[PDB]
CSV table of C-alpha atoms in Angstrom, one decimal:
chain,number,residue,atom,x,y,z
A,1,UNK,CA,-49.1,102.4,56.4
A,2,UNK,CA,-50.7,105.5,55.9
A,3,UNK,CA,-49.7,108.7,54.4
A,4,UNK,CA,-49.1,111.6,56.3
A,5,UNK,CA,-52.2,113.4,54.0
A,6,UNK,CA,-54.2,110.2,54.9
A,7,UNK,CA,-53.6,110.0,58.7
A,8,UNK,CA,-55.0,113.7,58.8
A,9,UNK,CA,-58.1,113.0,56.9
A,10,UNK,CA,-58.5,110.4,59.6
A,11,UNK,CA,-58.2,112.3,62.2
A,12,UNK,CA,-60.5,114.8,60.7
A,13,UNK,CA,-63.1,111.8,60.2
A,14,UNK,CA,-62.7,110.8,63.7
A,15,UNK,CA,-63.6,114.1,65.2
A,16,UNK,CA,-66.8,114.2,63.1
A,17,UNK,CA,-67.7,110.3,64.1
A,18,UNK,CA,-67.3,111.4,67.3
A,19,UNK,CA,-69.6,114.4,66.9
A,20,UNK,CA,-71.8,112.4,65.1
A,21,UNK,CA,-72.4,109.5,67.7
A,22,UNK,CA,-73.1,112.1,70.0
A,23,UNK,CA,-75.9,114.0,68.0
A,24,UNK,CA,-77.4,110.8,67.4
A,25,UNK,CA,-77.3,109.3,71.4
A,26,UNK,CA,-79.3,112.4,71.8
A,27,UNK,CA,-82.0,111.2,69.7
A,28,UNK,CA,-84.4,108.9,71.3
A,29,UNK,CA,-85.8,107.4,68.2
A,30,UNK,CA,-82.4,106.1,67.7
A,31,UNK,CA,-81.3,102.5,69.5
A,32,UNK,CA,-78.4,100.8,68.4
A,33,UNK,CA,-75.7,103.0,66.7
A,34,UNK,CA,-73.2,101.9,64.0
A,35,UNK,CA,-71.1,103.9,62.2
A,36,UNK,CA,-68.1,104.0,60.2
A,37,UNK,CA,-65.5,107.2,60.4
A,38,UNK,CA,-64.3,107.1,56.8
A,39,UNK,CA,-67.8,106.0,55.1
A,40,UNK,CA,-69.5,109.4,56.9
A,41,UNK,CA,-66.5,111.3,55.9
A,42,UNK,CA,-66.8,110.4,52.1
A,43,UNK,CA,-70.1,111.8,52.4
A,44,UNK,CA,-69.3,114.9,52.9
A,45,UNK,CA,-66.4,114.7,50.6
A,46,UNK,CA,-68.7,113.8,48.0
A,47,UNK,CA,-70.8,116.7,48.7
A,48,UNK,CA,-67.6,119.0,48.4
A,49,UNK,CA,-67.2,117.2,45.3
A,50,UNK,CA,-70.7,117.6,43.6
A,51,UNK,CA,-71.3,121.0,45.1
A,52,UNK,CA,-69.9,124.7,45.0
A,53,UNK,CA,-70.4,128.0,46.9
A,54,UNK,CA,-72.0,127.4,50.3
A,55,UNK,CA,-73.3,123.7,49.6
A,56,UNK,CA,-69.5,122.9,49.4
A,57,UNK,CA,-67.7,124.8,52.0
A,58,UNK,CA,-70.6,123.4,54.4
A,59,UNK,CA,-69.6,119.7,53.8
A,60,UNK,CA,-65.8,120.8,54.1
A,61,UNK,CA,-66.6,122.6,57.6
A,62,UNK,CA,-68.9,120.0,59.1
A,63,UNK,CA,-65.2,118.0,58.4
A,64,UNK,CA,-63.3,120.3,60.1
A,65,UNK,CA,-61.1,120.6,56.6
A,66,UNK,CA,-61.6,124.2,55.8
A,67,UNK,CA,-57.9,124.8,55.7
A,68,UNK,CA,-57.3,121.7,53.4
A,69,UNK,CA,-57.4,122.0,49.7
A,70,UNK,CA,-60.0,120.2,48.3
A,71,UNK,CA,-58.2,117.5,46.2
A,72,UNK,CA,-56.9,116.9,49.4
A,73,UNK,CA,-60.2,115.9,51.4
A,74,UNK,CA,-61.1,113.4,48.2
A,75,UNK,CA,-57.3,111.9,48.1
A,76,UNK,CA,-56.6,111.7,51.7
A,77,UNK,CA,-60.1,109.7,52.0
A,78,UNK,CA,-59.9,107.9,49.0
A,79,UNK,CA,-56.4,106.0,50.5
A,80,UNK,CA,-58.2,105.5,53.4
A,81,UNK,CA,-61.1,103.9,51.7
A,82,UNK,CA,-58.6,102.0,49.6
A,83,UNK,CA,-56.5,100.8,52.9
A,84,UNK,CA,-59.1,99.6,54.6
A,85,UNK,CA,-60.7,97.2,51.7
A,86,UNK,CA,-57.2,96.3,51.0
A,87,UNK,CA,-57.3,92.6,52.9
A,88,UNK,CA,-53.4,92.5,52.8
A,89,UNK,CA,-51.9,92.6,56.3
A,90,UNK,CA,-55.4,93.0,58.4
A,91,UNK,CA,-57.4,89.6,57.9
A,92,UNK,CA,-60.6,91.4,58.9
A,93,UNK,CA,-64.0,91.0,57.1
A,94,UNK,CA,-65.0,94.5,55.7
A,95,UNK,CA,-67.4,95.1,52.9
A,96,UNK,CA,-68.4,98.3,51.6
A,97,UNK,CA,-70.4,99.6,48.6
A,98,UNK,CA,-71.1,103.1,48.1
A,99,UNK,CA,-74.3,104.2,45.7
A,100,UNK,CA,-75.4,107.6,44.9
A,101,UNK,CA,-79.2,107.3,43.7
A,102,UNK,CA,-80.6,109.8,41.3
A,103,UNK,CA,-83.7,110.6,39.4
A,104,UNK,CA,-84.5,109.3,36.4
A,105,UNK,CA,-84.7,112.9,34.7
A,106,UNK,CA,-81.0,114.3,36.2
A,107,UNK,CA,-77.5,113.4,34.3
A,108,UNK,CA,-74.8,112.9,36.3
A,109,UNK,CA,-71.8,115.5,35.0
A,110,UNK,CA,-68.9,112.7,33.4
A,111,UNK,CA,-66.2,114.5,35.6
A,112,UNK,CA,-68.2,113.9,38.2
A,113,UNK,CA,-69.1,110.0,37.7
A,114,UNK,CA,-64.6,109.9,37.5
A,115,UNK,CA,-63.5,111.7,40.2
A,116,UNK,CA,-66.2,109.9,42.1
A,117,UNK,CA,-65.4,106.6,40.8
A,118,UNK,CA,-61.8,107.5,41.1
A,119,UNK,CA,-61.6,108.6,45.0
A,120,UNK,CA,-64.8,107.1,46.4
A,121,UNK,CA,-65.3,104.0,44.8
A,122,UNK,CA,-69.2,105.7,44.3
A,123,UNK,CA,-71.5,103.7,41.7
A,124,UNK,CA,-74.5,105.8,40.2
A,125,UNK,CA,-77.6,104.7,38.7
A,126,UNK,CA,-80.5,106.6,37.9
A,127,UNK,CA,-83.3,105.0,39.7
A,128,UNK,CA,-87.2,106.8,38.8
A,129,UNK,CA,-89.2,107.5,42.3
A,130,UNK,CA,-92.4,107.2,40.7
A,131,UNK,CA,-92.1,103.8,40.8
A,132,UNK,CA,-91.4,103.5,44.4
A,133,UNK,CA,-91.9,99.6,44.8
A,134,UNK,CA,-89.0,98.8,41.8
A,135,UNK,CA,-86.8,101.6,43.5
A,136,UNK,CA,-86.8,99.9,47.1
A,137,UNK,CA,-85.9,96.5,45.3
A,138,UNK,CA,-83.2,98.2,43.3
A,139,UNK,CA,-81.8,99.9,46.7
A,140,UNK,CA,-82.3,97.0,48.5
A,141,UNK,CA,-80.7,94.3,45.9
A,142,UNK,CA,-78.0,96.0,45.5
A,143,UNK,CA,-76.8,96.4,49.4
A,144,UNK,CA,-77.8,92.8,49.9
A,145,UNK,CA,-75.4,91.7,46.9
A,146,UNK,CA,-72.6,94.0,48.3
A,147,UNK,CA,-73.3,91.9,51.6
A,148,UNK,CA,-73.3,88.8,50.4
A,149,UNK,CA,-76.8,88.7,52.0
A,150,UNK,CA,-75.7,90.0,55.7
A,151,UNK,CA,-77.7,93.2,54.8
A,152,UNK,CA,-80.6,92.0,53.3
A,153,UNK,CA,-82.8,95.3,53.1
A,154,UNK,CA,-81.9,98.7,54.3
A,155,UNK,CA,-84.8,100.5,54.3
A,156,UNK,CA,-89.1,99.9,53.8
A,157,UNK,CA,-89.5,103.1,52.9
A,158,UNK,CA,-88.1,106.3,50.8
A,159,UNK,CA,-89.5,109.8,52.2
A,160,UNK,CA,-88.3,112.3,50.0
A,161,UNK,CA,-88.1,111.3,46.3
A,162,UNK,CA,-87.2,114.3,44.9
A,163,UNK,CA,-83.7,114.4,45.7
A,164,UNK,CA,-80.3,112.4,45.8
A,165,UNK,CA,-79.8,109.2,47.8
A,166,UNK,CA,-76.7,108.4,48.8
A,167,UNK,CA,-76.7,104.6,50.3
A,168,UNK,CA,-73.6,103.0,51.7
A,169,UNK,CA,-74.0,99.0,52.6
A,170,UNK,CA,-71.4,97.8,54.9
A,171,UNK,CA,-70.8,93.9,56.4
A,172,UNK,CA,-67.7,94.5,59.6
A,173,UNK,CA,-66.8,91.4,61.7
A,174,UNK,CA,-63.9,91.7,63.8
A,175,UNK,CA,-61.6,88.9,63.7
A,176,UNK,CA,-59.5,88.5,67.0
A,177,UNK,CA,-56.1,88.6,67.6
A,178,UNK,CA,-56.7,85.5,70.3
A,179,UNK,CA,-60.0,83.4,68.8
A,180,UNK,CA,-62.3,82.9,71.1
A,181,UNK,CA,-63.2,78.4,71.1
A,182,UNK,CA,-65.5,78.0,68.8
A,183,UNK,CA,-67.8,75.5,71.6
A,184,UNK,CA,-67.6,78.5,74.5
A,185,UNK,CA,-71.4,79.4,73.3
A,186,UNK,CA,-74.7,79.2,75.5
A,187,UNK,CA,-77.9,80.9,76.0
A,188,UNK,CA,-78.4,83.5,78.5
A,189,UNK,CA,-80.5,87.2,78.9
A,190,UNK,CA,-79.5,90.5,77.4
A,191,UNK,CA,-81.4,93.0,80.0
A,192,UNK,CA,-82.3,95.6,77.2
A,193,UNK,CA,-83.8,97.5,80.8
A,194,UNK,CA,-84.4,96.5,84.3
A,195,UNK,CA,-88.3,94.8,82.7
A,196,UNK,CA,-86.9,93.7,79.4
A,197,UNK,CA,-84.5,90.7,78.4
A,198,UNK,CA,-83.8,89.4,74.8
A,199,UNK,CA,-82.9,85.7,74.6
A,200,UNK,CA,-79.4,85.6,73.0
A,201,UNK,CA,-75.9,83.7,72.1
A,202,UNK,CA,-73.2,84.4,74.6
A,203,UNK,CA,-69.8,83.9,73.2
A,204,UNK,CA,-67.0,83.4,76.1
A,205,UNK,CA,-63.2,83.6,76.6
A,206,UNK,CA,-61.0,84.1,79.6
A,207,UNK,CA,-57.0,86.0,78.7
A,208,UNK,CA,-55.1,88.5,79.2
A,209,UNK,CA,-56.6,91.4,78.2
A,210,UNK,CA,-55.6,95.3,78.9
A,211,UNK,CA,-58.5,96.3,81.7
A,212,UNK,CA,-60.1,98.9,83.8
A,213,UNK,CA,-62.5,99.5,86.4
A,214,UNK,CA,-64.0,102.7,87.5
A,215,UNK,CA,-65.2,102.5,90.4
A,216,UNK,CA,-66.0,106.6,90.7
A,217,UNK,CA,-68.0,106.3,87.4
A,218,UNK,CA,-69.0,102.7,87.7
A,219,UNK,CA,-68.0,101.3,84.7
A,220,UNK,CA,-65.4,98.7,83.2
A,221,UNK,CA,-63.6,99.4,80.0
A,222,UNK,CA,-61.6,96.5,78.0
A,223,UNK,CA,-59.2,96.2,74.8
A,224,UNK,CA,-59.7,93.6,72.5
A,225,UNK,CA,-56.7,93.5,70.2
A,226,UNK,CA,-58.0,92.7,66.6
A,227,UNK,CA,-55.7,90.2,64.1
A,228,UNK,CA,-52.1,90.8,64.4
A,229,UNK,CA,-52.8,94.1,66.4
A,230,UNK,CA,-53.0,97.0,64.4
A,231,UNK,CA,-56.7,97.8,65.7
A,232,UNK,CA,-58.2,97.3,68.5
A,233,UNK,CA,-61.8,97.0,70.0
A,234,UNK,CA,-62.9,99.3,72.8
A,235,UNK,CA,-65.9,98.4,75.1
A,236,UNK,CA,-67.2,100.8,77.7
A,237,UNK,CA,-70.0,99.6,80.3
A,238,UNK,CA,-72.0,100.7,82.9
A,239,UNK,CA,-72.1,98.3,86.3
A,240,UNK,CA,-75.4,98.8,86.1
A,241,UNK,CA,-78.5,98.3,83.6
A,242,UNK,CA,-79.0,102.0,82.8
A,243,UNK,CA,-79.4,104.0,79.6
A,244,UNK,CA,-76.0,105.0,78.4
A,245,UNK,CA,-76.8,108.4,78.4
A,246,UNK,CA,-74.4,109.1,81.6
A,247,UNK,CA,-71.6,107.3,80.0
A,248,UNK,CA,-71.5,109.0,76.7
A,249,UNK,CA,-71.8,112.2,79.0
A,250,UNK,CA,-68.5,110.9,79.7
A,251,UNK,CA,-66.8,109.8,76.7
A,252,UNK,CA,-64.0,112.0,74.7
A,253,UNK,CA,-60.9,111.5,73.3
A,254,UNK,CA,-59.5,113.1,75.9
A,255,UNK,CA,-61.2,110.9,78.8
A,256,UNK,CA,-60.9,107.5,76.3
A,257,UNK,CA,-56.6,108.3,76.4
A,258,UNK,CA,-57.1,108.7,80.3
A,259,UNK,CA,-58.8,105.4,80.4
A,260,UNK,CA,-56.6,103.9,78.7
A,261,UNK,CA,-53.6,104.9,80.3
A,262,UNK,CA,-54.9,103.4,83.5
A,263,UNK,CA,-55.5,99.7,82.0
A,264,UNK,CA,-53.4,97.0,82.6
A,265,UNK,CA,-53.2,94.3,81.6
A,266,UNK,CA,-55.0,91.6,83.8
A,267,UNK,CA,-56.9,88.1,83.4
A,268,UNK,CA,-60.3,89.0,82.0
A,269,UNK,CA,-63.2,86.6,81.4
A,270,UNK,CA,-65.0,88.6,78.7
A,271,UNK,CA,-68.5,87.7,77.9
A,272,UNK,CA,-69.6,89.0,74.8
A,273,UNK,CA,-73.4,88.6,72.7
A,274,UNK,CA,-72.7,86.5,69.7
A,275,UNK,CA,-74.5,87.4,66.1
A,276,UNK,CA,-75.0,89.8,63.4
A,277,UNK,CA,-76.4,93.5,64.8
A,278,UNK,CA,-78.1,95.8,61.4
A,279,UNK,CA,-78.5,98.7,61.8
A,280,UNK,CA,-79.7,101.8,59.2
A,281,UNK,CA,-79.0,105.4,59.6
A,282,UNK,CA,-80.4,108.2,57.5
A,283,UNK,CA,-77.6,110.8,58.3
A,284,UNK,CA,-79.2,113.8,56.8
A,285,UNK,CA,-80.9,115.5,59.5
A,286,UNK,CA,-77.9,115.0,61.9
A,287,UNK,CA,-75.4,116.2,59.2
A,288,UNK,CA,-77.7,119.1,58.9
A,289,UNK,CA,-78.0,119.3,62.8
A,290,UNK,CA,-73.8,119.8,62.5
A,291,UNK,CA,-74.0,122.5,59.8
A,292,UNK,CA,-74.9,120.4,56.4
A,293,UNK,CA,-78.0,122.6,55.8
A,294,UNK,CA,-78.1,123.8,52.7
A,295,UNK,CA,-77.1,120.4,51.0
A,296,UNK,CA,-80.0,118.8,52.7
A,297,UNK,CA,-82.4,121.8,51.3
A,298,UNK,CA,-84.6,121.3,48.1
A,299,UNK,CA,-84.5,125.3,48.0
A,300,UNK,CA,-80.3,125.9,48.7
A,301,UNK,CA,-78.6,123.2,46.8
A,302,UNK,CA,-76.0,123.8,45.2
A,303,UNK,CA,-74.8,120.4,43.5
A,304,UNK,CA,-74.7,121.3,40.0
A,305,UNK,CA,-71.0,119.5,39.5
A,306,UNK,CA,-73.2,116.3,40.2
A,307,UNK,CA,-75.7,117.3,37.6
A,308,UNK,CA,-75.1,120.3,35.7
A,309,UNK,CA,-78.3,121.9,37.0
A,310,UNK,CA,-79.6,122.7,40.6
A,311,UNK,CA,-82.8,121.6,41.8
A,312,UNK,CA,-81.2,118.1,43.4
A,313,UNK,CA,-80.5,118.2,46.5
A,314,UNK,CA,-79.6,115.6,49.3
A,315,UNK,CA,-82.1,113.5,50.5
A,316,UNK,CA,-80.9,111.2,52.3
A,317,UNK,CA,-77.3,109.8,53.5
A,318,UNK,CA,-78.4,106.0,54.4
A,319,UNK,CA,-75.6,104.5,56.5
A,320,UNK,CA,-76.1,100.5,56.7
A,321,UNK,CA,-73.8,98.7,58.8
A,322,UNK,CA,-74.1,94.6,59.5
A,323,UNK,CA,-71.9,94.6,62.7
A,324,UNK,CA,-71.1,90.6,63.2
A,325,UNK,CA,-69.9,89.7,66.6
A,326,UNK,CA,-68.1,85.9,66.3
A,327,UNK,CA,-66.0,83.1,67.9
A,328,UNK,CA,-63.2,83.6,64.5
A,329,UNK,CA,-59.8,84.9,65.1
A,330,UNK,CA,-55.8,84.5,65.0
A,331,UNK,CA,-55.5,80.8,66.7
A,332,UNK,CA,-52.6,80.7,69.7
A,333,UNK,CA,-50.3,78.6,71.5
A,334,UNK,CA,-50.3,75.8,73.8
A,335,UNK,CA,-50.4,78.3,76.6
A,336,UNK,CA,-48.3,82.0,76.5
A,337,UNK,CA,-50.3,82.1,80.0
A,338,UNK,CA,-49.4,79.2,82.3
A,339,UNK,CA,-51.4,77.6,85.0
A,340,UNK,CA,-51.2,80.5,87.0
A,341,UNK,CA,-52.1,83.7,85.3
A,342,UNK,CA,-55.8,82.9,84.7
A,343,UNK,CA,-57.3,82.6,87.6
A,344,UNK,CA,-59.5,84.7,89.5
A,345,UNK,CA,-60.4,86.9,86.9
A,346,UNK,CA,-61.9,90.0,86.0
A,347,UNK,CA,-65.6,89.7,84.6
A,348,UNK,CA,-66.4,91.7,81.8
A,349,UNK,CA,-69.9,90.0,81.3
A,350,UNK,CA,-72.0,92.4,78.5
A,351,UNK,CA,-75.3,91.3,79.7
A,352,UNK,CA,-76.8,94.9,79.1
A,353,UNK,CA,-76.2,97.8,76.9
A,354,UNK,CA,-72.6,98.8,76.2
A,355,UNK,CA,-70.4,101.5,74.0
A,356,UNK,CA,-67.8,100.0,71.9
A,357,UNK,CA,-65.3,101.5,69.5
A,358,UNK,CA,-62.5,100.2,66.6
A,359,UNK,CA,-59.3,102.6,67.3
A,360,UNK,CA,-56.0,102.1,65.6
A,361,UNK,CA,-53.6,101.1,67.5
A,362,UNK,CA,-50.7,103.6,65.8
A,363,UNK,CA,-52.6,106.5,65.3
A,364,UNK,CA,-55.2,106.6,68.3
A,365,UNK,CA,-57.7,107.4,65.4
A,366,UNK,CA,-61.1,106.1,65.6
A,367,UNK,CA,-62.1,103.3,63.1
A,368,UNK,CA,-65.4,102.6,64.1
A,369,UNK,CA,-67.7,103.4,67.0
A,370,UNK,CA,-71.4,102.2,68.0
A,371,UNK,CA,-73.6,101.1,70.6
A,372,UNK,CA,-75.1,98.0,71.3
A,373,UNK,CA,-79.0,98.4,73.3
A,374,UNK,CA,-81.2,96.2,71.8
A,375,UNK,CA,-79.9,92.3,70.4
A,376,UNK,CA,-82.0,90.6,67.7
A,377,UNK,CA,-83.5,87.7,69.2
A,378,UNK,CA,-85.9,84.9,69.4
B,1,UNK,CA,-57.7,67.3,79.3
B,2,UNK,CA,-60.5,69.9,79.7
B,3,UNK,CA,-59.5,73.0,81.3
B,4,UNK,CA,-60.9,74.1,85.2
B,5,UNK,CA,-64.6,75.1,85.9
B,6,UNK,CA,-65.0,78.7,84.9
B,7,UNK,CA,-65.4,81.3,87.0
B,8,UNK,CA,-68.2,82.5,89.1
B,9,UNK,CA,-71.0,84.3,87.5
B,10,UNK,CA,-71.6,88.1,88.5
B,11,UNK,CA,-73.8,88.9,91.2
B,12,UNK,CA,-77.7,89.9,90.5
B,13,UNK,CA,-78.4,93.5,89.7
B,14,UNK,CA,-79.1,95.4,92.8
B,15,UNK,CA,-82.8,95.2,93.8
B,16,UNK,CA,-85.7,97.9,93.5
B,17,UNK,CA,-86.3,100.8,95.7
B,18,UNK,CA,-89.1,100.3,97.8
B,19,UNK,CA,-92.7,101.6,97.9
C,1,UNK,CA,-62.2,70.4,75.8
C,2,UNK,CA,-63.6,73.9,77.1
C,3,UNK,CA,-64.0,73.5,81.1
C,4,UNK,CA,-67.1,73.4,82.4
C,5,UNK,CA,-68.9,76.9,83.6
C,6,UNK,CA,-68.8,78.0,86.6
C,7,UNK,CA,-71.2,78.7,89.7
C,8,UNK,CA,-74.0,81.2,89.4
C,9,UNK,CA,-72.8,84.3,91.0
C,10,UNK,CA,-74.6,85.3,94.5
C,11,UNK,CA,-77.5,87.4,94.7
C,12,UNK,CA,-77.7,91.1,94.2
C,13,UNK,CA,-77.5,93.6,97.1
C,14,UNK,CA,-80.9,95.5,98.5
C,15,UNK,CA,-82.7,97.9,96.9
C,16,UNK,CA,-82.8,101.8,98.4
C,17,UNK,CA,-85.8,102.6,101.1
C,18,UNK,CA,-88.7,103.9,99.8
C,19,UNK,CA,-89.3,107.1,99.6
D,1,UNK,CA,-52.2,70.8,76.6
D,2,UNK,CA,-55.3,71.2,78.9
D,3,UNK,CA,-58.3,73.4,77.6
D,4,UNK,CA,-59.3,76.9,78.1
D,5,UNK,CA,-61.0,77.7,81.3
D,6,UNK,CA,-64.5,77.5,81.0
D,7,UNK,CA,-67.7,80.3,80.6
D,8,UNK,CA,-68.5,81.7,83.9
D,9,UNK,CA,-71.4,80.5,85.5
D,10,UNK,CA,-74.4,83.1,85.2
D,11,UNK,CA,-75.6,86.1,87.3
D,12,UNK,CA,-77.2,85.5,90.1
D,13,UNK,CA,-81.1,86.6,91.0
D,14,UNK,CA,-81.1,90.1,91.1
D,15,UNK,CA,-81.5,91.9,94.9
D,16,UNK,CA,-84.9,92.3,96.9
D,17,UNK,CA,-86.5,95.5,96.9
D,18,UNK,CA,-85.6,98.1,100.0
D,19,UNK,CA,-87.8,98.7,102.3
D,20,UNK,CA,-91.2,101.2,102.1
């Protein structure tokens, strides 16, 4: 269980997911969304870390943490970061590597490298830009191995190379508190739009599940309880095939705790797309877009504690997520239902675009949030 | 034994607005 | 055994006039 | 015991268009 210290930082990171998400549904270059609370939070407490002055106070703003102390920010995440690789009590499949790239020519400060190592679980390697095709393979390699091959290359391409890159490489797959049967798989359409359907693996199960419907916004929202409930997933859909725009127009905390307040728990035959969803984000411009712009800036930076000097700045913030959606999960009894309570149930068939989020079920804090728009498929 | 049929799908997306 | 699916649901409503 | 219930069955055709 968390801290006290450690529940606040995740509060903190939740806001700024939240934030974040937004900013970033606002972009139309930007399709499916995954992100991580805790993993976008570490960057800026590695930028607090690394930096001083403006640079610093920045990255401890854009968190909301300006009235915590800074060994604070870097303890209260690093427990988090520790509790949620920790594999004890959750039985849910997270991996997570965090790299900080930088050039060949720039030493990274030996406190630095520690208290890094110590709170963020950060690697560092000086990789040299010049050679652009070795420093793609040495970026790519090394999310692939932290994978185990579900991320198998995160980028194609490097913009800037005279800055920082810092490169997290993440594999999440939720594991059920009910398993869904292994054979309950078909084929069917994922209408991407109204013209457009993707081919894909539907994955199928029919319980008792904590529902709502809104029929005044038009849109179902259902709680999947994760293995041995201490998270659950949240999924938010439109009746219709429509961007999601007007939903996320809709979602906050505030409206998420009314939602759920009005579930109950009914017979839902949930119909779900079945695979692995990658996705990469380069934070940097939406970080700056929050108030992260003079870490971003070749002519501002101030991350000397990184380096000693002060022309590096941050380049980029790649956030690299394989999402895998699967059968797997807690198995159950005989029946805890009965012949009776099954029938005629709720469809929550995800045949188009939906919002869907990890929240813990103590805290209410957000543990992971994303969209799905656009299925890989053949 | 196998369990019942499942349920009925959902219905078709509305249609398109006319010329 | 899973059961077997279910129907196909019934077709979707009208489109709007055209304007 | 007996099995789960099964998938549902899929969507149906979407809806004609209105009317000009």
């Amino acid at each position: 269980m968390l801290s006290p210290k450690a529940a606040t930082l995740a509060e903190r990171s939740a806001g700024l997911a939240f934030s974040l998400y937004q900013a970033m549904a606002k972009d139309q270059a930007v399709e499916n969304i995954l992100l991580s609370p805790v993993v976008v939070a570490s960057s800026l407490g590695l930028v607090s870390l690394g930096g001083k002055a403006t640079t610093a106070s920045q990255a401890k703003a854009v968190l909301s943490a300006e009235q915590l102390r800074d060994e604070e920010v870097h303890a209260g995440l690093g427990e988090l970061l520790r509790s949620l690789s920790n594999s004890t009590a959750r039985n849910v499949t997270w991996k997570l590597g965090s790299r900080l790239y930088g050039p060949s020519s720039v030493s990274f400060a030996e406190d630095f490298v520690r208290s890094s190592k110590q709170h963020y679980n950060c690697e560092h390697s000086k990789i040299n830009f010049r050679d652009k095709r070795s420093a793609l393979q040495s970026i790519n390699e090394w999310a692939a191995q932290t994978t185990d091959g579900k991320l198998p290359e995160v980028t194609k391409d490097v913009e800037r190379t005279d800055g920082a890159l810092l490169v997290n490489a993440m594999f999440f797959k939720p594991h059920w508190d009910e398993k869904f049967h292994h054979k309950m798989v078909d084929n069917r359409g994922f209408m991407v739009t109204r013209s457009y359907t993707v081919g894909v693996t539907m994955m199928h199960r029919t319980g008792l599940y904590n529902y709502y419907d809104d029929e005044k916004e038009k849109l179902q929202i259902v709680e999947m309880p994760l293995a041995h409930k201490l998270s659950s997933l949240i999924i938010l859909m439109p009746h219709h095939v429509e961007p999601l725009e007007r939903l996320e127009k809709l979602l906050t905390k505030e409206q998420l705790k009314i939602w759920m307040g009005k579930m109950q728990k009914k017979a839902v035959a949930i119909s779900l797309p079945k695979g692995v969803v990658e996705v990469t984000h380069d934070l940097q411009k939406h970080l700056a877009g929050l108030g992260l712009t003079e870490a971003i800036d070749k002519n501002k930076a101030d991350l000397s504690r990184m380096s000693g000097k002060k022309d590096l700045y941050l380049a980029s913030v790649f956030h690299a997520t394989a999402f895998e959606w699967d059968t797997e999960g807690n198995p159950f009894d005989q029946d805890i239902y009965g012949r009776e309570e099954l029938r005629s149930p709720k469809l929550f068939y995800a045949d188009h675009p939906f919002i869907f989020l990890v929240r813990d079920t103590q805290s209410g804090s957000l543990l992971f949030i994303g969209r799905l728009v656009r299925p890989k498929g053949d | 034994p196998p369990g019942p049929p499942g349920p009925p799908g959902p219905r078709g997306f509305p249609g398109p607005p006319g010329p």
